[PDB]
Curated annotation (Swiss-Prot):
Belongs to the cyclic nucleotide phosphodiesterase family. The chain holds residues 724 to 1036 of 1055 of the full protein. A divalent metal cation 1 binds at residues 72, 106-107, 217. The gene is PDE10A. Homodimer. It comes from Homo sapiens. It comes from the Eukaryota. 3',5'-cyclic AMP binds at residues 68, 269. This is cAMP and cAMP-inhibited cGMP 3',5'-cyclic phosphodiesterase 10A. Abundant in the putamen and caudate nucleus regions of brain and testis, moderately expressed in the thyroid gland, pituitary gland, thalamus and cerebellum. Residues 1-312 form the PDEase domain.
Amino acid sequence: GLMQFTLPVRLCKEIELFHFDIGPFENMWPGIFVYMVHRSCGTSCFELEKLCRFIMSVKKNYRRVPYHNWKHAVTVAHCMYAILQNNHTLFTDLERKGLLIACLCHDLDHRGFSNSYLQKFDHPLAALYSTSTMEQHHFSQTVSILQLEGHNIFSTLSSSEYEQVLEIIRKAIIATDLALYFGNRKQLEEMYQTGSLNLNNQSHRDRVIGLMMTACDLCSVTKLWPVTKLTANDIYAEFWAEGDEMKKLGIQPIPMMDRDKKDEVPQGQLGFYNAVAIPCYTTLTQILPPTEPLLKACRDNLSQWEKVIRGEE
Ligand SMILES: Cn1ncc(C(=O)NCc2ccccn2)c1C(=O)Nc1ccn2cc(-c3ccccc3)nc2n1
Ligand SMILES: [Mg+2]
Ligand SMILES: [Zn+2]
């Protein structure tokens, strides 16, 4: 009840900033996550015995892949923490509870391969889930862990508040399927410009929460340049491995995943910042003004990639 988590002074201050890096000490990430839940929700939102046991079960069910790992899980939840703390009054008690958990669980049991590779492989999960394959799997694993004896962190909610929170978490996690982001932001784009955006419309919140989820999930591009630069190795190690596997099936992968075309990475990063990241954080800044630092940090990094191309690094 009266047992706060407290971080050292530098973390205490820096964690409140969008660009905060959780650091290389694995053992502090669970305490960082609890620290965030407590400030974002209350010391009452979850029984600490159960929360702690849910966190360690989620950790166990992430794999040791270069990028889609436990570190990513907590990185994505912190960005969401930054968005919720900078938009105090816009979100319900339920939404603050459900979205930090959604972020922590959003890539549960990822294998470091795209939906596409599952499909070209004919992986069972592709038969069981035709679209958003890994994302439906990740929601399924979240529910599995919630149902372990001692792991139901929501058990204190009324029957309908529990259905409302599982429904938020499900939509939240499906939304991290980037194939659904493009149409989600086009609609949010039109809805904000024509002036029909209405946050009391549940189908409109859904869309907004979906874009928040895309923004947290991509937040590697919103760090200080050295974090972004070294992180990018990790995502390319999954991409190239998938390219290797595509080649093993007898399929030339897309260049993104062809390790023979490492050279064209800075150009490929440019396309991505322009086609995905900038549009994402632009539309997010328009709908939620206090998220502006993510857009600015993203633009700084776009600019840092242009510098790489020009030979200046
Ligand atoms: C999905 N998803 N999720 C996150 C990211 C990402 O790259 N995020 C950026 C970050 C992630 C982790 C750490 C640092 N920076 C992406 C993505 O599709 N990126 C991309 C997108 C398109 N491409 C094209 C190439 C390319 C590379 C070499 C030669 C030719 C082309 N390269 C591409 N890369
Ligand atoms: Mg994912
Ligand atoms: Zn993710």
